[PDB]
Structure 1
Amino acid sequence: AKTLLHKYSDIPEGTECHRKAYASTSIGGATGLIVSAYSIALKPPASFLEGVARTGRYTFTSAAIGAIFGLTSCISAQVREKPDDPLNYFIGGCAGGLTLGARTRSYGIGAAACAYMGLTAALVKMGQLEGWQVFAEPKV
C-alpha cells in the first residue's frame, strides 16, 4: 500500500537507523512476494514444496537487499552527516548489489548490480530533492 512507502518516507533525515531499516526491509519483502508470485504463476514449479522453496528464495533475497540498503544509507547519513546529498544513498545503492551479488554467488551479476542499483538509488534521492513527478497529474 502507499501508506507503507509513506511510512518509509518519514525517515526523518536518517535518524534512528533501525526504524528506517525495518521499513526498507518491509518494502524489499513486498517486492519479493510479488516477484515470487508472478514467477510461480508463469513458471509452474511442479511439486509445491519446491514452489515455497522458490518464494522463500526471492522473498528473503529482496528483503535482505532492502535491509542492507536502508541501514547503510542511514548510517552513512549519520556518519558523514552531510547528510542530504544524493551520494548519501549511492553507497547503499552500491552496497545493495553486493548483497544481490552474494546470493547469486557471482562476481559478475554482483558487479553490475552494484553500479546500476547505485545509480538508480542516487536518482531517487535526487528526485526527492527535486520533486520530479514521474507520474505527473494531467494539469496541462
Structure 2
Amino acid sequence: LLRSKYYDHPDGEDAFGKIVATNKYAVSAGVAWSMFDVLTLSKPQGYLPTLGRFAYNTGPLMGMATAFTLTTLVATNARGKDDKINYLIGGFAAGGVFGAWKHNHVAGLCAGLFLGIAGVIKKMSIEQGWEFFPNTPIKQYGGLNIAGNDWTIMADPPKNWTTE
C-alpha cells in the first residue's frame, strides 16, 4: 500500500495510491527541507516548536500534494478526456492552496502558473513516452588507448586463461 506509485494505474483508476504516492513525495521533500531549516535559519529551542516547524513546513506541502491530486482526479473524471489541461487545473489548484499558507492571493496564482506549466510538461512526458532523468545509454569509462595506458614497473606473470 505504501509502495504504490503514481503511474502504476491510469488516470482516474484509483485514488488512494495516487494520494499515498504524491503525499509521500511531499513528506520526503518537507522533511528534507525541514532538516536543513531548523538547524540553519530560525533555529527553535525545545521539543514543541521544533515539531511545530516540522509540521508547518511539511503539512502544507502535503496539502498542496493532495489538493493537486484531488482536483486532477476531479477534472479527469468530470469528462471523458484525459489531457494536459487537467494537470493545468491541478497545478492552479495546488498554487492556490500554497497561496493560502502564504496568505497572499498574488502568491497563490503566481505559483499556480508555474505548477500548471510543470503539470503540462509532465503530462507531455507521460503522453509522448520520454523520461526526465533517463539512464545513460552511453557512459565513456575512458578514452582511447585504454589498454596501452598501463605505465607500471612490475612485470606481469603469465596468465591462467587463454582465448583458445
> Which category of TM-score, normalised to the shorter sequence, fits these structures?
0.7 to 0.9
Residues 21-80 of structure 1: per-residue CA shift (max 9 Å, x gap): 343223222211211122123225131332221111011100001001111101111112
Q: Provide the residue aligned with 2:12 in structure 1.
A: 14
* 5+ long unaligned stretches in structure 2: 139-164
Aligned residue for 2:44, secondary structure, equals coil
Percent sequence identity over aligned pairs: 26
Aligned residue for 2:39, secondary structure, equals helix
Distance 1:10 1:105, change over 3 A: same
The amino acid that maps onto 2:110 is: A
Aligned residue for 2:5, secondary structure, equals helix
Matched ranges for 1:24-63 at <5 A:
24-43=22-41, 45-48=43-46, 49-63=48-62
Q: Please report the RMSD computed on the Cα atoms of aligned residues, expressed in angstroms.
A: 2.0
Q: Provide the residue aligned with 2:73 in structure 1.
A: 74
Paired with 2:124 and 2:9, the residues of 1 have a C-alpha distance of: 16
Q: Provide the residue aligned with 2:162 in structure 1.
A: none
Aligned residue for 1:9, secondary structure, equals coil
The amino acid that maps onto 1:107 is: H
Q: Provide the residue aligned with 1:105 in structure 2.
A: 103
Q: Tell me how many residue pairs correspond in the alignment.
A: 136
Q: 4+ residue stretches of structure 1 with deviation over 6 A?
A: none
Q: Contact 1:28 / 1:67 at 8 angstroms: preserved in 2?
A: no
Give the structure with the larger helix fraction.
1
**Larger C-alpha radius of gyration, 1 or 2?**
2
Q: Contact 2:96 / 2:109 at 8 angstroms: preserved in 1?
A: yes
Q: Contact 2:76 / 2:86 at 8 angstroms: preserved in 1?
A: yes
Q: Which moved more, 1:98-107 or 1:20-29?
A: 20-29
With normalisation by structure 2, the TM-score equals 0.74
Q: Which moved more, 1:38-47 or 1:69-78?
A: 38-47
For CA contacts below 8 A with separation 6 or more, give which structure has more relative contact order. 1
Q: Contact 2:6 / 2:18 at 8 angstroms: preserved in 1?
A: yes
* 5+ long unaligned stretches in structure 1: none
